[PDB]
Amino acid sequence: RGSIEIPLRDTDEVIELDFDQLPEGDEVISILKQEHTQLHIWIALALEYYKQGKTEEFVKLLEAARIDGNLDYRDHEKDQMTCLDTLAAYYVQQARKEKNKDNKKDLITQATLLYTMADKIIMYDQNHL
Amino acid sequence: TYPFDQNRFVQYKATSLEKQHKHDLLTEPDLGVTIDLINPDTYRIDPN
């Protein structure tokens, strides 16, 4: 919403990040991953950043969420394919709002390569095609 | 022969042939909409 929950390792369900302020997304990766937090929260705060009106830090913090597919998660690789299809769609979406400086391929390369790892685990998603 | 003016210029103008043309809208080739199944976080299909 404006503050959803980030679970801890010990005495979980205690800490919050209020989204009315804008923290940097890289320290978010940290404060999530010292807590071995489930991959679902990475999608949830990505959606929080997107509903906060962000398309680029939103799409680059999830690149740091591409590392932790099944880190301590007990088969949340379904959650990693959901993570990676978001970049496979929003790299190619942010390539359409291209600017004067980069190329379209400057995002299409990352979209196409990450899609290949997206199809390593799962085939013919409703977003793969 | 007649000494015709070289008609290198438009003053009639061609505006009858011009504003009769209705102009296409091709700003975005998929017709001005971002095509996405992820940004519908909301849905009106719920009540109501």
From Swiss-Prot, chain A:
It is found in: Nucleus speckle. TPR repeats lie at residues 39-73. Widely expressed. Component of the PAF1 complex, which consists of CDC73, PAF1, LEO1, CTR9, RTF1 and SKIC8. The PAF1 complex interacts with PHF5A. Interacts with KMT2A/MLL1. Interacts with STAT3. Interacts with SETD5. Interacts with ERCC6. Component of the PAF1 complex (PAF1C) which has multiple functions during transcription by RNA polymerase II and is implicated in regulation of development and maintenance of embryonic stem cell pluripotency. PAF1C associates with RNA polymerase II through interaction with POLR2A CTD non-phosphorylated and 'Ser-2'- and 'Ser-5'-phosphorylated forms and is involved in transcriptional elongation, acting both independently and synergistically with TCEA1 and in cooperation with the DSIF complex and HTATSF1. PAF1C is required for transcription of Hox and Wnt target genes. This is RNA polymerase-associated protein CTR9 homolog. The chain holds residues 3 to 131 of 1173 of the full protein.
Curated annotation (Swiss-Prot), chain B:
It is found in: Nucleus. Component of the PAF1 complex (PAF1C) which has multiple functions during transcription by RNA polymerase II and is implicated in regulation of development and maintenance of embryonic stem cell pluripotency. PAF1C associates with RNA polymerase II through interaction with POLR2A CTD non-phosphorylated and 'Ser-2'- and 'Ser-5'-phosphorylated forms and is involved in transcriptional elongation, acting both independently and synergistically with TCEA1 and in cooperation with the DSIF complex and HTATSF1. PAF1C is required for transcription of Hox and Wnt target genes. Belongs to the PAF1 family. Component of the PAF1 complex, which consists of CDC73, PAF1, LEO1, CTR9, RTF1 and SKIC8. The PAF1 complex interacts with PHF5A. Interacts with POLR2A, TCEA1, SKIC3, KMT2A/MLL1, SUPT5H, RNF20 and RNF40. Interacts with UBE2E1. Interacts with PINT87aa which is encoded by the circular form of the long non-coding RNA LINC-PINT; the interaction enhances the binding of the PAF1 complex to target gene promoters and may anchor the complex on target gene promoters, sequentially pausing RNA polymerase II-induced mRNA elongation. (Microbial infection) Interacts with influenza A strain H3N2 NS1 protein; the interaction interferes with host cell gene transcription, specifically with that of antiviral genes. This is RNA polymerase II-associated factor 1 homolog. It comes from Homo sapiens (Human). The lineage of its organism: Eukaryota, Metazoa, Chordata, Craniata, Vertebrata. The gene is PAF1. The chain holds residues 50 to 97 of 531 of the full protein.
